[model samples]
Target: SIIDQNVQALFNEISADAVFVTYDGQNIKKYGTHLDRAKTAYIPASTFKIANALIGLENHKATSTEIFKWDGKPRFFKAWDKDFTLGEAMQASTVPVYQELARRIGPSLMQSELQRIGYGNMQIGTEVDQFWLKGPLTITPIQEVKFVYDLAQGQLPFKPEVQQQVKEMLYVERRGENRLYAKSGWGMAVDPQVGWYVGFVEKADGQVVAFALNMQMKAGDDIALRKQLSLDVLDKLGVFHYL
Candidate 1:
């Protein structure tokens, strides 16, 4: 079933429209938007880092602890101006570091790995660094949850340790007995900005819940709400005690 009217009302309160989906291994629940839009593909933006990290580890381009030196070049994000390890890059969502990693991995290998994982589109475009950000690589909210679910269960084509380390990189916080691991992404370069917060939760009882949300963002929109709303939905579903 779609989310109840009450949940829709909550989204209304935020003055934003969204598409949300959750997969608990067996069951799936959706809310706010139509199923077609939920399946419609959009630029994955930084959420593709989850896939990028896995591919990097799979090809031995870098380890979770390996350092990616910063060349002191200016970037849009000030936080990206320093050296970073896999963990730091994941934390900061640093573009240059991952660009280097993708260059090392190369497009052919990236296409192979993406195919193995059944990632969306599996199209790498022409430029390795700009492919995910620009165009020709798109995924749906449902596919995002499914990918996270596979990653959560050690089901991606990479080694169990590789998947485990990537999961560690995505960790957000500890909420009581539930630990959340997620990635936040916003494709501001494109019109009608698209934002995402996609990942899974490890419950105290060992149950894993996978979730993904995509929303339209206009200028002056509250950016924090991208993550906040997803967490709020999880809270409303009783996945966590509070938002």
Candidate 2:
């Protein structure tokens, strides 16, 4: 219930139309235009890799240290061309490796597992491998916040060890006493293209605030704006205090 303009200014500064929501235990704060989109599901893109990683660990289909050998097929992003362990694959956001892992997770297990995680209507459509990547599967910002909040708190319907491993794979950075764990997504399969930055911040005093934000990314738009805008919003929201 504070000044929404403060958050809007961050979005406007980058000329992005987006939605941002953060939850710290009880309170939920939101900003940006078309607040209704916060609940409107859209393709999750690479951000779903966080959930995929969780599934991969739970089913023993992946490991942080075992290499997923490259097929030697050239990839669009050069970083994805070589071998990757699950942790490294996640950090690289390598599609091929995760796609292979999804194929191994298969539709039946993937479906039931998604149902257990309560992820985005549990819609995998018919394709087990590409649902979240290209998506007939979709999730909204509000849903993203809830999922990550549960993840941060280890409240998801999964083993604690698995959740902890997933967090380890999602880790992005730590500044001072604050730790930021996040994933970025780009949904190029759709009309306007969707971009995502979702994760939680853990403070020195052990408080955690979970955040999820998405924006309209046209073809040539700076994809980095997904994380940049989210960080600016987080900074403005007082989620961080420099040490």
Candidate 3:
């Protein structure tokens, strides 16, 4: 389909190792168009924030109004300052704030939540409180797909009340009769760019589709192109306007 072609062009132009795009509740494909592993996994970067938020919301450890004070001193990084809410931390994409948020929510609790929700590869450091701050948090497109399915169905990944909370938190705006809710992650390391954006589009037909694409590129490029490409691919696949 044209959507697959366009998505392929975007990844090829960006020099990405793998790209996964789904539309209209189906994964688009053609002969020989697949992944080296069929599943694409990356550092997860800030995309893990989505899971972190889910963990936070489910445990009742903090309210959506809970505010985390940012002391003037740096906790993990040397260049950041100021306090933030879980909402604000997500809005601002401040890594330190989120890492600390995870620390406050505690390791054992969050680890058990991850295992319960199907993200088992999540690595917690010996420091316990330091896990979200660094190292390889990983996930693939297939797992991401299942996540949104459960999210939409108001089932497993979280309790009903917690799912409602996450639903309220993730909801951004309306797209026709449908709602658009999403989160994005961008990371860079060594000589490659590591990035991800995972979320779903709720359609009028009661079908929900989750999507994730992990990308890598040279240094110095912001993630605007990927965002644009995802929207375009969705549209091309005839699902962009289905909402």
Candidate 4:
């Protein structure tokens, strides 16, 4: 019941270099298509917000309700120029705030805990703030799928309650009978840039699918394409019935 050979049409139509992976706790498929690219590690960009939340909470760098005060500094995004709690920063994806968190975690705890988390290559490059956003740190779609799945299931090696708190931080919406959780991201550390929309949807019937997609950002901020494409795949998989 896997679309192993058919997911390519979606990528072809967009003239995109991309890979999508979904796991429903059944068939252990690797990625949307092109197994080789799925193994290709890409800078995680903001998708690291998911992990940042987890790491920060685990080591006392920040709390779910911990407030990151904004200094009224100008920023590219107006929404980011205000004070926000840890969870709020994640939801808003305020880069500077998270970078500050990364600075606080510093190289010591970030390296140690990241290794323990076993996420991606676990190379933080010693440049605390730009590790995930800039370079020397990388993760593949396969790693992303496995990480988020383990995270959602509380299988990661952290205080159980800490994991629970992080999961709640990622929660977005609650559909009729399905709960939706998601995060979108971008990476410029590679050519053609890269974008992501990754997370899972809890089907009404009780199945959980963790999905990861990384694609070429040909149009700069083709931001919506990431999640839009993922949603199309889920619809194609019958996980969602769009009317």
Candidate 5:
């Protein structure tokens, strides 16, 4: 079932925490990876927008049809951009719109949403979780992959309509297929380290897979190296691009 022998070899070459998954016509298999702190909470970065966007849409706070126009003035955060639809903001990984989205959704409701959606040990508050930014947030690779798998199957804890909205908001359009739905989280440098959460939804086969990677490094360059390696491994994992 491990079609990509090179993935294991590359894992040794990079020596950073990663998870790679592939689903057969039925069951799924994963190779190499840590089960511990890798899944534990890390700054969700833009990936949190998956939940934020869903909350905005289903709660009637906003819609993908809604448009947000940027002033075009440059800001400290270069990732910010102009003219964001709910979907475009997600695709562009715009942090400002997401932050506003979170505020509109409100803390108690978002916490309920996370709980309803069954994100493993996802804590929400009026303020962002500071520990996730600097330290740990508990998540397991199994949880990550299972979350995607269940979501794809319409088996998540939320009501059917809620899950459907989340599904539409969270998917990433890549390659020629819409099957691979995904959101990636990239954390700020924790003094020479970096982190990521990336995954895909394979609709044709009705599958979704996700992975969280955490790297400890000594310089910014190491961060880029590790991040690319994570993507390369996913590239081999047979998602939309792989297919």
Candidate 6:
């Protein structure tokens, strides 16, 4: 009830056409424009990496520490040019390494795993590597929230250890008694960028709060707002006071 009440107050502060969903195991709260739009699936972009990492480990495609060598080809991001471990790739949100992982995981395996996890659309399309980027695969905001919630609880169809390792890679920041674990996604390749920051918060009480927020962005809109707005909402909910 406290969380829902705070969310209602915070909803008024957001200016963008955004959708935010929060689930604390029992209570679920949603806000912002076109709340029903949150049910419509959109490309998950890099947020899919959270699922990618888990699938990789569960299938023995790679370990958290396994190095994915960077091919000689250049990418737009300098940070993504070099080799990366699964943890490093996740933090950096490197595209190539994960793309390579998807290729290695293959489309059939990916489709099966995506279906198993209830990922939206679950269509790999023609390109195994491009499916999550601008391909057929898509996920709704509510689905994203549920996915993270299931992950935090180790309720997915994967080993507890696999889920635990993926969560480790998703950790964002720890402020005093509270910890934040999230993944950010920016869809630059698609028109009207789709942004996402999805994950869960572990409170001092041992309860985990899961959330997913997606904002429609224009050409000049700052992509950072995706994460900022979510943080602002969380702060309004009195989630950061422990810091």
lDDT (CA) per prediction: 0.84, 0.84, 0.62, 0.79, 0.59, 0.84
How close is every model to the real structure, measured as TM-score? 0.94, 0.94, 0.80, 0.91, 0.74, 0.92
- Model 6 CA deviation exceeding 4 Å by range: 1-15
Report clash pairs, candidate 4: 20-32
In model 4, the Cα lDDT at residue 12 comes to 69
Clashing pairs in 2: none
Q: What is the lDDT of candidate 5?
A: 0.59
- Which pairs of residues clash in candidate 5, taking residues 3 or more apart in a chain or in different chains? 39-139, 40-137, 40-138, 40-139, 41-137, 41-138, 179-201, 179-203, 180-201, 181-201
lDDT-wise, the better of 4 and 6 is 6
Against the hidden true structure, what lDDT does model 3 obtain? 0.62
Q: What digit string (tens of lDDT, one per residue) describes model 5 on residues 59-138?
A: 77776677777878875567765678777777667776776777777767777777777765767544743323443333
Report clash pairs, candidate 6. Answer: none
**Model 2 agreement with the true structure over 56-168: per-residue lDDT tens digits:** 88888877677898878899888788888877887789988889989989999999998887899789989887897677899989889888888888988878998988887
Candidate 2 lDDT score at position 134: 73
- Kindly provide the TM-score of model 2 when superposed on the true structure, using C-alpha atoms: 0.94
Residue-wise C-alpha lDDT for candidate 6, range 81-182, written one tens digit per residue: 898998889889998889989988998899898888778877888798988888678888888988898898899889999999999899888887688999
Give the Cα error of residue 164 in candidate 1, in Å: 0.3
Superposed Cα deviation of residue 231, candidate 6 (Å): 1.1
Task: Give me the displacement of residue 214 in model 6, in angstroms.
Answer: 1.0
Error of 6 at 56 (Å): 1.1
TM-score pick, better of 1 and 5: 1
lDDT of 2 at 35: 73
Candidate 2, lDDT over the whole model: 0.84
Residues 1-243, model 3: lDDT tens digits? 665565566455554555655533455332112464226555566667767877877777666677777767765544347777666676566787777668777868877877777773666656544443345456666666567656767865577876766666666566787766666776654335566666777878787766665566567666576567666656665555534
Provide backbone clash counts, one per model: 0, 0, 1, 1, 10, 0
Please identify model 5 stretches exceeding 4 Å from their true place: 1-4, 21-30, 33-39, 71-73, 125-138, 158-165, 168-178, 189-194, 203-219, 222-231, 234-243
